[PDB]
Design a protein around this nucleic acid. Structure first.
Ligand SMILES: NCCC[C@H](N)CC(=O)NCCC[C@H](N)CC(=O)NCCC[C@H](N)CC(=O)N[C@@H]1[C@H](O)[C@@H](OC(N)=O)[C@@H](CO)O[C@H]1NC1=N[C@@H]2C(=O)NC[C@@H](O)[C@H]2N1
Ligand SMILES: NCCC[C@H](N)CC(=O)NCCC[C@H](N)CC(=O)NCCC[C@H](N)CC(=O)N[C@@H]1[C@H](O)[C@@H](OC(N)=O)[C@@H](CO)O[C@H]1NC1=N[C@@H]2C(=O)NC[C@@H](O)[C@H]2N1
Lengths: 100, 215, 50, 136
RNA sequence: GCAAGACUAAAACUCAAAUGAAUUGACGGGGGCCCGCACAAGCGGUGGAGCAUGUGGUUUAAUUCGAUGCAACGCGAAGAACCUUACCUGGCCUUGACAUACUAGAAACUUUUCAGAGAUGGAUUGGUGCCUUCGGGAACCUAGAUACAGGUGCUGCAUGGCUGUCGUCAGCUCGUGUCGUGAGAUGUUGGGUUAAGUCCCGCAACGAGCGCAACCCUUUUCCUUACUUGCCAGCAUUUCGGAUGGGAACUUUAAGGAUACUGCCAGUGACAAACUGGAGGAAGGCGGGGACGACGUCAAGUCAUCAUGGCCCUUACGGCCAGGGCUACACACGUGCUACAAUGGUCGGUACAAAGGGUUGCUACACAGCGAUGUGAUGCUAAUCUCAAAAAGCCGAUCGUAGUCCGGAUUGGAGUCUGCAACUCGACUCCAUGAAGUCGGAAUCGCUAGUAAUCGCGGAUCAGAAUGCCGCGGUGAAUACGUUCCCG
């Protein structure tokens, strides 16, 4: 991937980490029954007023080695191209060729 | 056609893994990434130390890296100063204290990685590729190997059309899963591009299975 | 396995997680101390519950 | 198969009458693994013909199948004993479907009863076959 | 010489070759031999319909870029509302979002606001941190300067690495002797047999190595160890629920082992390799399946995973943002899903799996709703709790061949959930509507047994979004006379 895309993902991750507590508090207040309807509406507006990158749906899993955005395999954190190379030379513990 | 990786196909038969630790699904990815970073840093830092195998282990909240080298003196230092450094940067890269252990290779000519690195370094100095392959094969066969195969691919000798050459002496039974085959790949960067080098060394079959390999 | 396009050319990998259970009853005073003094082998995770 | 000659598969007799002819007829009737439905149809037909005429179902079925059984097929060629039974069951299956009784078991029982006395659509099919056969 | 022409017969100029025989390979619209779901024999599909998905074309501001006979077309993509995103419109930055090298200043940061579509810009708070030889150095930020950074821009026909294909096709090589002036040849050659250059007889040759087979995984029978979170044969108590005391038998779980070797018996081949039949045995001649792909072919595929020679841009072909597009639509093709019904539709009652997933997760149970779902609440970091209802199946009733009580496209209305946000462009629920379709031309595809056919279940990707892909089990067939013909 281009270096700009990797820096973009890094920036989005940092923003998500920064705004994590306030967003959780806002959603809890929204889902709080005991709070007044006015309070819930104000919390909804506050949650809608956050920066877009604060939301975690805009994060895309990329290969930890090359930044490829397709074929991720969350368990290893590597795209398929690097996963094949690293597995077949013995650097991934416990992974072997499967036959049955 | 294409050929399977000689170590990958034997990883569960007569070969061990270069990584030996356990992690739950949450920590597995983080551990793997830090291990790969450690391997890359070590490979970059110890080019001239004849380093072949790096084994990473995580016993319990710590790290242990075993480095197999043919020049333990360069890795260790005149008073062991460099091992303290290596531990410092490895503890920085990982998140746990790390111990560095040294494993001397007393037969450098039976190690596939070192032979490939020697051939690549020679090719990077405009040495004739046929001469380099023949010398490497002769030295390995004299060191007591049962067979060796060496292959070079690319713009050999500066030619505009790339081609693949290979030379072999002895036996290399790749289809036998219990054969002890060491395999290595290394690239040499010349002014005309990249030349790939592949080395296979056969050291005899392994009888008794993985149980006798003592997994 | 191919860099660009061969959907039927794939490598199939597996990883297995083995689990063992051990029960110790009527432990002698030396038992807990010896178990804690036992070394930690790499590649095996050990959990103890009292 | 060019070189290898393959043995013919051996099938088990049906649990009720121990008749491989009944088992093979059930196999011909069955679609996409619904052997239970095939058994229901065949056993219902046999019970129906038995209550109509007090005669052993195995004997009645074999006599009727021999009656419908072709010595030649359809452009004439020759056939072997196995093909004879295969084609007899094949032609017997369809006419029951084109009949008009409310259930397949009743339809097949009626078709067998009509073919036994010679006024059956399978009998007409065999007649077409042999009146085609004398052409050559 | 009637003629057509015959006979005798040069030079200028031009090239560094033109030739003969034999050797190795390659090729042939030359020959011979064999094998393969190649054809035959069967079962079920496609081409016809509606919808899903990919492609061509057309359209567009853009419809981003690759893959193109078999071997591209549910392909990269294991999952495009924003993001992804690479494309378009418009708004912005320029040593840069990111590295090293130099010169200085600043803890880093932190609270409220305003303008703006946002990128950005302007005000406004609090903090002012760490180590010391403490005269400054560690982190992070800001400012200036130039070598540079950056480029999913071009060349896969300059490359590495990786992959497809012939094709699981059966071949490919080496030593000492002999023959030839020589390049080279012999060995690998013929007769049987085999999945096999597998093996045996023949053979100026004898011997090897890699290919084949085996070693590896899984399934079928038995044994040992192990007895919980799993099991319940015997005993006892039962709230009749392994629920409880209890048992270690059985099922299972999962490590290590045993067993099959033509071993035995009866004939053949040849006096062999082999072949045929029988008993025992869970299994008999390779028991089934997976992984493993020889020397080589196609300037095959990938500079858009990555690396890399060369070329090109540098206030732009680099970088940031909001909206749009990749989802268009007179058409054509590929791969699929659902049907056309009675071996079926609907309704009521009632049985039997395997494998896999679960802590920002799966959820018992109760209440509310017709429902998607919501609220409260419980167990589970799991042989412990949970997803979970298996479905086809069996019993009973009804429908009685109708475009139907078949089919479920399309459209109107009303909702739930994920998400900052479902207009372009999500999934699901309810009411209403009820299209084509009555078995599909020339032609064409898959499959030889727990297979085809049919039925349900799970996972990767993933906030949400599978008829695709990768797996799991249930029910469970038909036919193979044979090698003419078609293909390789
Ligand atoms: C009759 N109708 C016309 C005729 O005879 N003409 C002439 C004529 O006699 C004469 O010629 C003159 N004198 O005028 C002769 C030679 O002199 O040739 C003749 N012609 C010819 N034609 C012939 C030819 O070609 N070859 C062979 C021979 O036959 C030749 N003679
Ligand atoms: N789009 C842009 C693609 C450009 C491409 N990159 C140019 C390229 O690579 N040129 C190569 C190159 O000069 C060299 O090849 C290697 N390997 O350096 C040479 C050696 O033969 O061949 C040329 N290629 C050739 N193709 C031709 C062929 O077939 N006949 C006739 C003659 O034109 C042949 N020369």
């Amino acid at each position: 991937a281009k270096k700009g895309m990797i820096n973009r993902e890094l920036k989005r991750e940092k923003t998500v980490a920064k705004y994590a507590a306030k967003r959780a508090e806002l959603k809890a207040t929204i889902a709080n029954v005991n709070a007044s309807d006015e309070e819930r509406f104000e919390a909804m507006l506050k949650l809608q007023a956050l920066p877009r990158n604060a939301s975690p749906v805009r994060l895309r899993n990329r290969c930890g080695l090359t930044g490829r955005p397709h074929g991720y395999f969350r368990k290893f954190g590597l795209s398929r191209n690097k996963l094949r190379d690293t597995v077949m030379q013995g650097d991934v513990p416990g992974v072997v060729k499967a036959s049955w | 056609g294409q050929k399977v990786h000689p170590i990958g196909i034997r990883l569960g038969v007569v070969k061990r893994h270069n990584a030996n630790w356990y992690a739950n699904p949450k920590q597995y990815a983080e551990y793997l990434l830090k291990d790969l970073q450690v391997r890359e840093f070590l490979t970059k830092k110890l080019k001239n130390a004849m380093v072949s195998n790096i084994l990473i282990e995580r016993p319990s909240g710590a790290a242990k890296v075993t480095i197999s080298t043919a020049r333990p003196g360069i890795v260790i230092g005149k008073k062991g100063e460099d091992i303290e450094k290596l531990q410092r940067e490895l503890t920085n890269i990982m998140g746990v204290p790390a111990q560095v252990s040294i494993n001397e290779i007393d037969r450098p000519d039976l190690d596939a990685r070192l032979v490939a690195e020697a051939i690549a370094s020679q090719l990077e100095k405009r040495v004739m590729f046929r001469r380099a392959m023949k010398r490497a094969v002769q030295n390995t066969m004299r060191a007591g190997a049962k067979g060796i195969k060496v292959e070079v691919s690319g713009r050999l000798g500066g030619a505009e059309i790339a081609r693949t050459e290979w030379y072999r002496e002895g036996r290399v039974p790749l289809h036998t899963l219990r054969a002890d085959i060491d395999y290595a790949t290394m690239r040499a960067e010349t002014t005309y591009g990249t030349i790939g080098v592949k080395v296979w060394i056969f050291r005899g079959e392994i009888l008794g299975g993985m149980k006798q390999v003592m997994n | 396995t191919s860099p660009h396009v061969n959907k039927d050319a794939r490598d199939q990998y597996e990883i297995r997680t083995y689990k063992r259970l051990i029960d110790i009853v009527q432990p002698t005073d030396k038992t807990v101390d010896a178990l804690m003094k036992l070394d930690l082998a790499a590649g095996v995770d050990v959990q103890i519950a009292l | 198969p060019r070189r290898r000659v393959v043995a013919a598969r051996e099938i088990l007799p049906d649990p009720k009458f121990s008749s491989q002819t009944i088992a093979k007829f059930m196999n011909h009737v069955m679609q996409d693994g619904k052997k239970s439905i095939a058994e229901s149809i065949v056993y219902g037909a046999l019970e129906r013909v038995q209550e109509k005429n007090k005669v052993d179902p195995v004997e009645f079925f074999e006599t009727t199948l021999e009656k419908v059984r072709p010595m030649v097929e359809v452009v004439p060629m020759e056939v072997r004993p196995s093909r004879r039974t295969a084609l007899a069951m094949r032609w017997l299956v369809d006419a029951a479907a084109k009949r008009s009784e409310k259930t397949m078991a009743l339809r097949l029982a009626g078709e067998l009863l009509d073919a036994a006395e010679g006024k059956g659509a399978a009998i007409k099919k065999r007649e077409d076959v042999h009146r085609m056969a004398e052409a050559n």
